[model samples]
Target: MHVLTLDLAPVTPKDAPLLHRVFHLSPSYFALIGMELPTLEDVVRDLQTLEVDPRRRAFLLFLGQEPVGYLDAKLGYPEAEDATLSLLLIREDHQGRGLGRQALERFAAGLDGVRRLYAVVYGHNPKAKAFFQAQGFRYVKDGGPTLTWYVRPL
Candidate 1:
């Protein structure tokens, strides 16, 4: 729908340094989820996990030449019948620009066969409950004391 768009560019382990750089730029986000900052070693290990999963789709969300965000999704995760939207993040400086919604909508719009997309967002990230709800994701349930599940029918 966005003819002038946010590019969901594919990423791999070779781009670990770039990914590491972007990940560090979002300390506020990490804290929101009560997670510690990820180091370069963590980025390498994480990319290795993503690489082994055939259903994984990792992307660097780009606006023109600037990599403004990241999205990590997996098909048939937690359920064989749908795609799970594992992570979506905009750089800390880019958070209020609506780039996160654009990136998510574009990625969701491009899917086939998997008629649903699931997500697990930490409850501590207070902004997500409303943000994801507005983007068509219905709160499924509280997966735990601090995490909740949501799903959007594609």
Candidate 2:
């Protein structure tokens, strides 16, 4: 089955509740990060922060008309041409469908001046690391006991 319809809609404060529900429902994400689920207020505050921060941005990911995930990125980080994929969480039911990979590819391709893209996968999340490797990212450094950073040229 082909998911011919996927979209990345810029997230606004009004979408906080939606994001909250998606995050809470995504067990894989919580497990991978080893963090407790966040409250609605937490989600709201995070959205507000992203809205005010010039370098940070968030998007509500959709497969057709169904909301499936969220994507957040930080741009112009350590350098002007660098960007990082802060978060990419797809609903568990939507996993292995290629939606996340395709959306990421589309997003990265649209980064006109971004020379390198970075993502940090939890050490426990081998599947995520493999996904990044498959996308041409190479291990950059060990971020911490739980995190390993990867990078790819855009």
Candidate 3:
């Protein structure tokens, strides 16, 4: 097996440039989510805003010495006893190597007072659906024509 050391750290303003680098690399992923890739300034502004939401948590995923992905989760989401996996973005080159799974595993394990976690995946992205299923998430419902919601128990 490929050994990887995936870790999550708070996403601060100081990490905006690094965040932008990864964001720039994920235009295709963003497109699937009906989002246009944000510019560096936009990322900085959003990060600053997100820093203050007590119920929302964001992180930059580090693979040993390098930042490689981002994750955001919301507490008490989609009703009680549940959390939401708001965002999980792996830098393009670093994807398809189990880093997404590792990051999610850590995120789920670290959450407190939650019985389940939920996420919305673009239906056009079969890889995402498969990945989440492999991680034990069950389909909840179709969020829309292009979005599917999933839930995994903690």
Candidate 4:
């Protein structure tokens, strides 16, 4: 798939339904990360909270006119390495079509006030791990099944 210019925009409270679908914890996903299945309502609640947090910034990825994925970041401690990349998700159908890499690069470029970037992944998400490595991120710390941290220089 041709990687069109991925338009990144702030996600709104109304984006909860799409976020719930994008944030699914399927069997394969759980096998790696141990995430519990979240009710749609719970997901909506989380997205709503994220939507309103002044310190949080959420970006939605659009390919031309279609919504394909999203990412969310929160400012980290000023003494810390960089802004924390809290969440990133690509629509299932659009997986492996280059949208993810494009979204990631765009997110990295758009970020300000950070010298490095950090992303947390489930230990078993080999695809995500590999993608981060390919994008120049390196393992920083391992938090077992809960979170695997990776960082890249800006």
Q: Please, what are the lDDT tens digits per residue for candidate 2 over residues 9-111?
A: 9999999888887887797678667788888998888888889988886789987767789988999875778999978888888888888887898788779
**Which candidate ranks first by lDDT, i.e. highest?**
3
lDDT of model 2 at residue 79?
Answer: 74
lDDT of 3 by residue, 29-79 (tens): 888767888988899899889888887879999877677899988888888
The best candidate in terms of TM-score: 2
lDDT of 3: 0.86
- The better-scoring model by lDDT among 2 and 3 is 3
Report model 3's TM-score to 2 decimal places.
Answer: 0.89
CA-lDDT, candidates in order = 0.84, 0.84, 0.86, 0.74
lDDT ranking, best first = 3, 1, 2, 4
Whole-model alpha-carbon lDDT for candidate 1: 0.84
What's the lDDT for residue 63 in model 4? Answer: 79
For candidate 1, write residues 56-139 as lDDT tens digits.
989988778777789999988777878988789898877877888888888887787787899889757768778899888998
Q: Which should have the higher lDDT, number 1 or number 4?
A: 1
Clashes of each: 0, 0, 0, 0
lDDT of 4 by residue, 6-71 (tens): 888788768766656555623345455666766778867877788667778787777776677778
Lowest lDDT block of 10, candidate 2: 27-36
Residue 27 alpha-carbon offset, candidate 4, angstroms: 7.7
Q: What stretches of model 1 exceed 4 Å from their correct place?
A: 1-4
